[PDB]
C-alpha cells in the first residue's frame, strides 16, 4: 500500500511515416508493456509489381509477448492499411472508434482473413487500464470522422499522439474536436508530443471546409460535361462535399472501386453522411444520362485514387473511361512518393482531351494543419519533448522550428529516421539505438 508502482524506462520508435507522409506506425515502449500506435500502408512509389507498402515489423515481432495493443487513431489508409497484415503475425488488441473498427473489419473480410481478432471500440471517455499505465483518448478533426488522438499516462507525464488533424471551425459533429479535453492534457503535464508532420512546411492556417466547398460549387457550376472525382476512399469531407454540391447542380453521383464502395456503405449504415434521395446511381447507369448530369467519385479498387485515374486517362480501366471533354478534380495530399504518377497522369489527362480543375489557392489539399494550426497544438499541449512525425524529413524540421518557436528546449527535440529508438531512463532523452526497419512490398 505504501509503494506505488512507477514508471522508469520509455522507449519511442518509428517504424513508418518518417521520411514519408504515409504507412504510419510509432512503437512506444513504458517498461515492459509496448503499443503500437497506428499501421498504416503506403501506395507504391520506380517501384514496379507492387500493390502496397507495409513497415516491417520484425523489431514488434521479435518482442511480441510484450505487445498489448494496436491504437488506431483513424480510417485513413495511412493509418490502418497494414492492419490485417500485422493481425496476420501477431494477436494483439486493435483499439479504435467505432468507424475505425468497421472499416478494420471491413479490410479483413476483404482479404478473406478468418482469424479471431480482438477489437475493442473506445471513444473519448475510455482509459484503457494496462500494467504500467492508462491510455485515455481525445477527439481530433480529421478528413474522416470519429478521429482520437491517443494520451498514454505515465509517471514522467503523458505521451500524446495527434494522428492527423487540423483547427477547423466549420467541422462540427463527428469532426469536432475536443479543444478542452486537449487542454486539460497539456495542464496536467505533456512528456512527449508526437505531432503530425504532413503541411507544416505551409503558413497560416489550411483554409477552412466551408470555404473549399463553396469553391469547389464555384468550379463544378462551370463543368460542361462529366465530372470526375480522384480522391482517397477515406476523405469523407470532400466526399460529403461533392454529393451536397451534386444536389446543387441537379447532377447524380456514382461510385467507381471498391473500397469507396465498401467504405461508403459502411459509414451510410452508421449514420455519418447526409444524402439526398435518388442522388445516387448504379455505374453501370451513369451512361443513360446527359454528361452535364453526372459525377463519378472514383479510386483505386484498392484505395489509390492516382492509378485509377492514370487508367481511365490512357482508356485501360476495366469499368469506365476518360472522354474527350470530361473535367477531372484530383483530391490528394503531395508527397515525394506520388509526384511523378501525379504529373505523368495529369499531362496523360490532357493528352486525352480532359479538363483539370487546378490545384490552387482556391481549392487544395486541406487536411493535416498547417504551421498555425501546429503551433496551436504545442500550445496547448505543452510538452516537454517533441517528436515531429508523419512527413517526409523536410516537413519533420519545419516542425521542429515551429515548436522552438512555441518554446520547446531545442535540446528536446528529436528528428527521428525510420528505427530509430528515442529513450528516456527518467535522467536523460537519448538516441543511440537502432532497430531493424524498412519496407514490405505486397503483390
Avoid at 451536397?244 to 452508421?270: W, Y
Wanted: glycine share 6%; net charge negative; with cysteine.
Amino acid at each position: 500500500s505504501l509503494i506505488k508502482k512507477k514508471n522508469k524506462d520509455i522507449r519511442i520508435i518509428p517504424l513508418g511515416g518518417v521520411g514519408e507522409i504515409a504507412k504510419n506506425m510509432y512503437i512506444v515502449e513504458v517498461d515492459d508493456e509496448m503499443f503500437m500506435l497506428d499501421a498504416g500502408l503506403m501506395f507504391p512509389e520506380e517501384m514496379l509489381g507492387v500493390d502496397i507498402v507495409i513497415p516491417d515489423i520484425q523489431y514488434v515481432i521479435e518482442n511480441k509477448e510484450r505487445l498489448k495493443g494496436i491504437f488506431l487513431t483513424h480510417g485513413h489508409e495511412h493509418a490502418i492499411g497494414a492492419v490485417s497484415y500485422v493481425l496476420e503475425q501477431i494477436d494483439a488488441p486493435v483499439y479504435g472508434s467505432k468507424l475505425t473498427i468497421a472499416l478494420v473489419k471491413e479490410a479483413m473480410k476483404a482479404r478473406n482473413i478468418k482469424k479471431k481478432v480482438r477489437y475493442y471500440t473506445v471513444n473519448h471517455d475510455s482509459i484503457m487500464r494496462f500494467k504500467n499505465v492508462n491510455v485515455s483518448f481525445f477527439n481530433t478533426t480529421a478528413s474522416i470522422p470519429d478521429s482520437l488522438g491517443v494520451c498514454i499516462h505515465t509517471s514522467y507525464g503523458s505521451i500524446v499522439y495527434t494522428g492527423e488533424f487540423k483547427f477547423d471551425q466549420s467541422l462540427h459533429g463527428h469532426y469536432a474536436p475536443d479543444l478542452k479535453r486537449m487542454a486539460e492534457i497539456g495542464d496536467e503535464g505533456v512528456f512527449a508530443l508526437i505531432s503530425d508532420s504532413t503541411e507544416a512546411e505551409k503558413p497560416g492556417y489550411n483554409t477552412p471546409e466551408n470555404i473549399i466547398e463553396h469553391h469547389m460549387y464555384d468550379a463544378f457550376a462551370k463543368v460542361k460535361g462529366r465530372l470526375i472525382v480522384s480522391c482517397y476512399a477515406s476523405n469523407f469531407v470532400r466526399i460529403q462535399q461533392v454529393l451536397n454540391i451534386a444536389s446543387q447542380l441537379n447532377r447524380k453521383v456514382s461510385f467507381l472501386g471498391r473500397s469507396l464502395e465498401s467504405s461508403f456503405n459502411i459509414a451510410r449504415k452508421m449514420g455519418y453522411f447526409d444524402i439526398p434521395k435518388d442522388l445516387l446511381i448504379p455505374i453501370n447507369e451513369v451512361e443513360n444520362y446527359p454528361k452535364n448530369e453526372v459525377i463519378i467519385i472514383a479510386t483505386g479498387m484498392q484505395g489509390e485514387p492516382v492509378e485509377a485515374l492514370s487508367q481511365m486517362a490512357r482508356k485501360k480501366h476495366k469499368i469506365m473511361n476518360i472522354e474527350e471533354g470530361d473535367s477531372i478534380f484530383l483530391a490528394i495530399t503531395a508527397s515525394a512518393n506520388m509526384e511523378v504518377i501525379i504529373a505523368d497522369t495529369l499531362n496523360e489527362l490532357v493528352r486525352a482531351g480532359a479538363h483539370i480543375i487546378p490545384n490552387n489557392k482556391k481549392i487544395h489539399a486541406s487536411s493535416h494543419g498547417c504551421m498555425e494550426e501546429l503551433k496551436m497544438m504545442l500550445n496547448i499541449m505543452k510538452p516537454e519533448y517533441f517528436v515531429p512525425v508523419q512527413g517526409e524529413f523536410k516537413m519533420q524540421i519545419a516542425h521542429a522550428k515551429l515548436a522552438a518557436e512555441t518554446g520547446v528546449a531545442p535540446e528536446k527535440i528529436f528528428l527521428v529516421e525510420k528505427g530509430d529508438v528515442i529513450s528516456y531512463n527518467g535522467k536523460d532523452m537519448i538516441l543511440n539505438e537502432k532497430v531493424q526497419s524498412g519496407n514490405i512490398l505486397i503483390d
